[PDB]
Amino acid sequence: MLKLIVKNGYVIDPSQNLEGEFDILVENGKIKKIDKNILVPEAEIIDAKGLIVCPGFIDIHVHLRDPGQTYKEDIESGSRCAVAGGFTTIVCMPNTNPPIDNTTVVNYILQKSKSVGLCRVLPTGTITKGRKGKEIADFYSLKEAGCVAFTDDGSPVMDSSVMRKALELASQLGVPIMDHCEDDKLAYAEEIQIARDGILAQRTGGHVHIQHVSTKLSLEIIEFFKEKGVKITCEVNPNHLLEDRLALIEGVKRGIIDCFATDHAPHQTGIIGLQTALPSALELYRKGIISLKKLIEMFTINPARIIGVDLGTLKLGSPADITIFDPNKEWILNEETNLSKSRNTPLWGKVLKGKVIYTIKDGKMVYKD
Numbered sequence: 001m002l003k004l005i006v007k008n009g010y011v012i013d014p015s016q017n018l019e020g021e022f023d024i025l026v027e028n029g030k031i032k033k034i035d036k037n038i039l040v041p042e043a044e045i046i047d048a049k050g051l052i053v054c055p056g057f058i059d060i061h062v063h064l065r066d067p068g069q070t071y072k073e074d075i076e077s078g079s080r081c082a083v084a085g086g087f088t089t090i091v092c093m094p095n096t097n098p099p100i101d102n103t104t105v106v107n108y109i110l111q112k113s114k115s116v117g118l119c120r121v122l123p124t125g126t127i128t129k130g131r132k133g134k135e136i137a138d139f140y141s142l143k144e145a146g147c148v149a150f151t152d153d154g155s156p157v158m159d160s161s162v163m164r165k166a167l168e169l170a171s172q173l174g175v176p177i178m179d180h181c182e183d184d185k186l187a188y189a190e191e192i193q194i195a196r197d198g199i200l201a202q203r204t205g206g207h208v209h210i211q212h213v214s215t216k217l218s219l220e221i222i223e224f225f226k227e228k229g230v231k232i233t234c235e236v237n238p239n240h241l242l243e244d245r246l247a248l249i250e251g252v253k254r255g256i257i258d259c260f261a262t263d264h265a266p267h268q269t270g271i272i273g274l275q276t277a278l279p280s281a282l283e284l285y286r287k288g289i290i291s292l293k294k295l296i297e298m299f300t301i302n303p304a305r306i307i308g309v310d311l312g313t314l315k316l317g318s319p320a321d322i323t324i325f326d327p328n329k330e331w332i333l334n335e336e337t338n339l340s341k342s343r344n345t346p347l348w349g350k351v352l353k354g355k356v357i358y359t360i361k362d363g364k365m366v367y368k369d
């Protein structure tokens with residue numbers, strides 16, 4: 001099989017303002033052509049009739065618990081949840097044990113990702129050594145080794161002078177600082193912190209990404225900074241939307257929230273979400289809060305742009321990372337379907353609507369329903 005033809009689907013690629021009933025031809029792990037009615041020899045054909053065909057999803061906030069808490073989740077089990085949920089690329093947080101503050105840990109995660117061979121797992125580095133909040137980490141080395149962002153996630157930066165230094169360095173390197181996830185409260189004020197981050201981002205030219213927002217005022221502050229050209233973004237977990245749910249839904253509706261990111265947070269006594277993010281987001285679509293195109297933007301090109309990777313598109317020549325889903329397929333996360341080592345989600349046992357049928361990474365099927 002030299003080629004794949006994804007046939008009969010409704011293709012949506014927001015990055016190109018492209019949508020319609022088209023086929024996709026994939027060769028050499030790349031998008032080769034998008035056209036009506038493609039047939040070539042030596043191909044596998046996926047029949048996407050009645051399905052939505054779009055770039056592979058990108059989750060920029062996942063806790064894989066690896067190294068150090070691999071009984072809760074590991075790179076393999078999280079990657080299995082990821083591809084089952086349409087994600088071809090996930091970004092793992094650095095509050096592992098040991099934390100991702102040196103190239104040995106970085107290389108560990110990259111080699112795991114390679115051997116597991118499902119989704120791309122991109123590491124982040126810590127902002128400070130040991131995430132202790134005192135001494136800035138070596139962002140140059142960590143980036144060179146493959147880190148795509150920096151965060152003390154686990155534990156928000158409390159030292160304003162550390163945040164400024166972090167954003168300074170981030171600006172030199174062309175990578176974001178992620179801030180304001182308290183995952184450490186179980187692996188191991190909001191408005192003021194966001195305003196601080198917006199101010200420092202403006203002052204340094206660095207990109208800050210707010211990992212958790214919960215109030216209308218936080219959203220209004222973020223939108224203010226964005227309107228003034230400050231490189232600030234934010235995310236929401238669609239699983240949490242079904243604090244201040246309603247303000248968050250208005251923030252999605254108005255485009256203040258840039259992307260869906262799960263904050264997949266395995267625990268065995270934050271919620272898991274990679275495997276359910278899509279049906280959760282689709283509930284907002286079915287309720288008229290967002291268009292399907294906007295839903296796709298928030299899973300694809302928007303998070304790609306936040307982390308500066310050339311993914312989240314179906315542009316000719318790009319990696320053939322492709323998600324194929326049925327917006328109306330009902331299913332339940334339970335013991336028959338769960339690929340996490342944990343079960344910590346209020347969606348457990350509930351009827352979900354929307355399911356990934358195929359996930360394709362570099363032209364290879366890595367998930368099929």
Ligand SMILES: [Zn+2]
Pocket residue numbers: 061063093153154181182183211263
């Ligand atoms: Zn986190």
